[PDB]
Amino acid sequence: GHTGKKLMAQVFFGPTYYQRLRHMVDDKIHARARGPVQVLTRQPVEGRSRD
DNA sequence: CACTCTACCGATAAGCAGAGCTACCTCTCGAT
């Protein structure tokens, strides 16, 4: 596509049935600087959903 | 001086109970 030149190799090409799986990156991405701690250990809490 | 007859510590298993069982991560759901 960049040059319009043919590819030296031919490409296996055609329809195939593909699935959209439940795993999406913006449901997983997570970062923590500081945030909440456990009352008993004062160590950071567990889980994306709790910071 | 040839006998048993019992108090020893070996060396046996011998039976047992418990101690342990990859790393990190996601989400939903129920009970207190």
Phi, psi of A27, rounded to the nearest 5 degrees: -95, 0
Nucleotides in chain B with any atom closer than 7 Å to protein CB: 25-28
Residues 6+ apart with CB under 8 A from A28: A48
A35 touches strand B (CB under 7 A): no
How long is the CA A50 to C1' B21 vector, in angstroms?
31
Dump the DSSP string for A26-48: GGT----SS--B-TTT-SBPS-G
Beta bridge partners of A44: A37
How long is the CA A4 to C1' B7 vector, in angstroms?
108
Task: Report how this structure was experimentally obtained.
Answer: X-ray
Nucleotide nearest to A28 (CA to C1'): B26
User: Cα separation of A30 and A24, whole Å?
Assistant: 13
The structure was resolved to a resolution in Å of 3.0
Beta bridge partners of A37: A44
